[PDB]
Write a protein that binds this ligand. Structure first.
Ligand SMILES: *[C@@H]1O[C@H](CO)[C@@H](O[C@@H]2O[C@H](CO)[C@@H](O)[C@H](O)[C@H]2NC(C)=O)[C@H](O)[C@H]1NC(C)=O
Ligand SMILES: *[C@@H]1O[C@H](CO)[C@@H](O)[C@H](O)[C@H]1NC(C)=O
Ligand SMILES: [Ca+2]
Ligand SMILES: [Ca+2]
Lengths: 440, 473
């Protein structure tokens, strides 16, 4: 009879004396002061940690956590790698427009589509554009820019587009969020009010992952290529039959790919090995490097490594892996002639003041873990205006009306009648009537 | 052209084409019109018009209702005639089907499905390859006793397993012994990897049927145990010890161990017994040690096919057979994807030091998963693992459908005491080819099987004359 604080629930079926039990940290301890373990880390009694929306506590060698429902996340990345809302990795290489997510599941309020095209000569395909239908408005993410289309006359469901780090973030007041890295990666986040009322390549988000392969006609299949083929949009698009194997069709490119992608398994990421399993990212890195055989193959690799570095940051391991010879980043390009304010933030853990949050506007998600270059505005004009990427005084930032920036003083355009508008010299947008009939 | 300009500017012209004024025809009841939306509903892609980013022109369209038929080949048929499809065959609106764990009926265009009970299976294969009740494959390489699976209530049962180093390095492990704790943990049964099953530290004889559970040994290389609670066990003793556990569907969420919780979600499978979820495969496993004295292990971020170069060519040349469509395994390609089995075949063949034994053990796992979904691989031992196919005893021959109740004369004497169901057919030496196994040696014909008490020769009489197998008592 020798308990150890880790065989507590085992049963002791098959040193410390009677009573006290080994804790794994040192001398014997009573059951009450028995510590807790998590991801190869040993926490004493009465500690605190957070898991993605909640907070926990090591009570009696056991964790007690709050119960709130975190958001739901779907991931699209690489040459056709998908992660659904309930955590089911898979691959699919199509050439058509596919329903990423939607609410018209057998009347609906939105839809998010994607556009996959071939990239390479081995047959693999990758995403290169996004379309967002909200009510009647249609946003399109394309050519590193956001384009509005068919803006509805007077409903104009409130959204917000901005740029954080290297990523472009589009949020909707209803509870939809899209994060786009401008090349191939996409994250879709949904609020917990949509639970079990969506369908598409990202599953139906019901905390149950044995039914995410539901086809368009409400049938559960067991094949990736049948689930994928049933969500194409144009009926004339062809059907996928087999998944190509890049590194087998391009033998001469293997040696390089297996050598560069090996950094994930090196000692550089030694801190993150106990928190995120690197194998499903190493496989994606090798798969992507063997396929980009028509040019610009140093860009397929850096994004693949960044996808894993971002998760390491998200779980609490800020790692600095870029070097002047490995995926360099050119930040100070944005600085004024020779005043140094923009800095490469390896893991984005910085909360500064913009002219949006200065007026009480706040988001609903923490995006404090995105890589990129960030400002460090000086002390003579410390408010970061986003639509121009400029450090300005608290007075002269902008107005931000109808998702359009307007410089202070500038006559604010208005799609109303008899209503002129101006951005005051106090960052305040104010409108007046004109009796030229109509009145106030 | 005037009409096209009329439509393009924003106007909507009316029909002018009559039967005598340049008419136009389309197949079926496709009526020609001007100024109608090209966004059509097609009996599969419904609600297209809500996402229509285009203006309208002329052409052949459908009436107000009667969405266009896409699955079939008719015209603008009504909505309540849409024929369903399922990997080919065109199912009519009213024809039913039964899928794996559910049954569906073709309603108007869309299936209506209803769940059916179907059990779950945990598998411990190879030296270290654990498949939970919800997939979630991972590799461990442990060294201790571990709690494979035990009923959570207080006592119901417990199933353990000895994972320990097997060759030279720590990275070559094996399963060495299976321990079962049942009957309120008042009975301990032990299976060692040499046969020699023993109960309460005492050797036992097979078959052994009791009130609570039972054990059988149909082919001398497979031990099959049934428990009245709803647990079923298969233990394979060659070429490498393996374990398969099957549970009913009335114990969903009441099991804990290395085999997960069996609740339908494969993300909380690594959920420790003390709250939060782990990230790696070794971190979660260490928390289920049955002996406090054992140490903790860590994952292994390497591929054995890169450390043993001389073995890589051998491993590839054979494990690649799984993807060859002309090979016997090519048949199974329709049902079960072979990619994971191929990768694990390479891993095991490169890693262990008995390369042929690991090759055969890995190759015999595909031919069990496939033989569970109907497709049965007949005669797949003709080139690869025929090392013992021809070694069967005098009248015995290697069979692929050697089930439990193809047994000797005494099995027919009762014929209903030990015919446990829900057990997959297994291979091995036998010959129940209407020649029922004799008391010993060659499998004699039905005429003189035996008269089973003791098994007498085919010349005795009780007045119940001794005859072929059965007795006219
Ligand atoms: C964060 O979520 C809240 C919760 O809805 C959003 O607040 C909504 O805002 C819209 C318009 O601004 C109102 O019509 C809703 O009534 C609000 N919701 C509630 C519950 O009051 C908020 O807009 C979201 N954040 C952003 C930046 O849009
Ligand atoms: C096994 O299959 C063979 C097929 O040739 C046939 O003899 C029979 O279906 C089975 N044999 C038995 C049940 O003894
Ligand atoms: Ca689901
Ligand atoms: Ca589970």
């Amino acid at each position: 009879r020798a308990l150890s604080c880790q065989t507590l629930a085992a049963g002791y079926y098959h040193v410390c004396p009677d009573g006290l039990m080994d804790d794994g940290r040192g001398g014997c301890v009573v059951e009450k002061e028995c510590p807790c373990v998590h991801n190869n880390d040993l926490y004493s009694s009465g500690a605190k940690i957070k898991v993605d929306c909640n907070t926990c506590t090591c009570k009696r060698g056991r964790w007690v956590c709050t119960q709130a429902v975190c958001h739901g996340t779907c991931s699209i990345y690489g040459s056709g790698h998908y992660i659904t809302f309930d955590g089911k990795y898979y691959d699919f290489d199509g050439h058509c427009s596919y329903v990423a997510v939607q609410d018209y599941c057998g009347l609906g309020s939105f839809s998010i589509i994607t556009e996959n095209v071939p990239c390479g000569t081995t047959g693999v395909t990758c995403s290169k554009a996004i379309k967002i239908f909200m009510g009647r408005t249609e946003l399109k993410l394309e050519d590193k820019h956001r384009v509005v289309i068919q803006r509805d006359e007077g409903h104009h469901v409130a959204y917000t587009t901005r740029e954080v780090g290297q990523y472009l973030v589009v949020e909707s007041s209803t509870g939809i969020i899209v994060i786009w890295d401008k090349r191939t990666t996409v994250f879709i986040k949904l609020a917990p009010s949509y639970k079990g009322t969506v369908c598409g390549l990202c599953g139906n988000f019901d905390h149950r992952s044995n039914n995410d392969f539901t086809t368009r006609d409400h049938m559960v299949v067991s094949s990736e290529l049948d689930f994928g083929n049933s969500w194409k949009e144009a009926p004339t698009c062809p059907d996928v039959s087999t998944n190509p194997e890049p590194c087998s069709l391009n033998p001469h490119r293997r040696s390089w790919a297996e050598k560069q992608c090996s950094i994930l398994k090196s000692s550089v990421f030694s801190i993150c090995h106990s928190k995120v399993d690197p194998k499903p990212f190493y496989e994606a890195c090798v798969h992507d490097s063997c396929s980009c055989d028509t040019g610009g193959d140093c860009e397929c690799f850096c994004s693949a490594v960044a996808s894993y570095a971002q998760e390491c940051t998200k779980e609490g391991a800020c790692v600095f892996w870029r070097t002047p010879d490995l995926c360099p980043i050119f930040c100070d390009y944005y600085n004024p002639p020779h005043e140094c304010e923009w800095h490469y933030e390896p893991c984005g853990n910085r909360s500064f003041e913009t002219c949006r949050t200065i007026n009480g506007i706040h988001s609903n998600i923490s995006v404090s873990y995105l890589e990129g270059c960030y400002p460090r505005c000086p002390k003579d004009r410390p408010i970061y205006e986003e639509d121009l990427k400029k450090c300005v005084t608290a007075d002269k930032c902008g107005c931000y009306v109808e998702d359009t920036h307007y410089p202070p003083g500038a006559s604010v355009p208005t799609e109303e009648t008899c209503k002129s508008c101006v951005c005051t010299n106090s960052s305040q947008v104010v409108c007046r009537p004109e009796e030229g009939f109509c009145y106030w | 052209e005037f009409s096209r300009q009329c439509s393009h500017a924003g106007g909507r012209p009316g029909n002018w084409r009559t039967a005598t004024l340049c008419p136009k025809t389309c197949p079926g009841n496709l009526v020609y019109l001007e100024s109608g939306s090209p966004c059509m509903d097609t009996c599969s892609h419904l609600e297209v018009s809500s996402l229509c980013e285009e203006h309208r022109m002329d052409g052949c369209f459908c009436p107000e209702g009667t969405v266009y038929d896409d699955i079939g080949d008719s015209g603008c048929v009504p909505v309540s005639q849409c024929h369903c499809r399922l990997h080919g065959h065109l199912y009519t609106p009213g024809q039913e089907i039964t899928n794996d764990c559910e049954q569906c009926v073709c309603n108007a265009g869309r299936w209506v499905c209803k769940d059916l009970p179907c059990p779950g299976t945990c598998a411990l294969e190879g030296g270290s390859h654990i498949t939970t009740f919800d997939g979630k494959t991972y590799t461990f390489h442990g060294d201790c006793y571990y709690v494979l699976a035990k009923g959570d209530h207080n006592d119901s049962y417990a199933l353990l397993g000895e994972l320990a180093p097997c060759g030279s390095t720590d990275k070559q492990t094996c399963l060495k012994t299976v321990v079962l704790l049942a009957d309120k943990k008042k009975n301990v049964v032990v299976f060692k990897s040499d046969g020699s099953v023993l109960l309460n530290e005492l050797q036992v004889n097979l078959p052994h049927v009791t009130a609570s559970f039972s054990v059988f040994r149909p082919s001398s290389y497979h031990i099959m145990v049934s428990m009245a609670i709803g647990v079923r066990l298969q233990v394979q003793l060659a070429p490498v010890m393996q374990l398969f556990v099957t549970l009913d569907q009335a114990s969903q969420g009441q099991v804990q161990g290395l085999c997960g919780n069996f609740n339908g979600l494969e993300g909380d499978d690594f959920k420790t017994a003390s709250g939060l979820v782990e990230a790696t495969g070794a971190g979660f496993a260490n928390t289920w040690k049955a002996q406090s004295s054992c140490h903790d292990k860590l994952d292994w971020l390497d591929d054995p096919c890169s450390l043993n170069i001389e073995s890589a060519n051998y491993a590839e040349h054979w494990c690649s057979l799984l993807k060859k469509t002309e090979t016997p395994f090519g048949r199974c390609h329709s049902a079960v994807d072979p990619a994971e089995y191929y990768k694990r075949c390479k891993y095991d063949t490169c890693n262990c030091q008995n390369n042929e034994d690991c090759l055969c053990a890995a190759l015999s796992s595909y031919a069990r998963a496939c033989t569970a979904k109907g497709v049965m691989l007949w005669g797949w031992r003709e080139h690869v693992c025929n090392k013992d196919v021809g070694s069967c005893p005098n009248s015995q021959v290697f069979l692929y459908n050697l089930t439990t109740c193809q047994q000797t004369c005494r099995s027919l004497s009762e014929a209903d005491s030990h015919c446990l169901e829900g057990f997959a057919p297994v291979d091995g030496c036998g010959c129940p080819d209407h020649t029922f196994l004799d008391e010993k040696g060659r499998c004699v014909p039905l005429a003189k099987c035996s008269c089973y008490g003791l098994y007498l020769e085919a010349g005795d009489v009780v007045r119940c004359v001794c005859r072929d197998g059965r007795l006219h008592c």
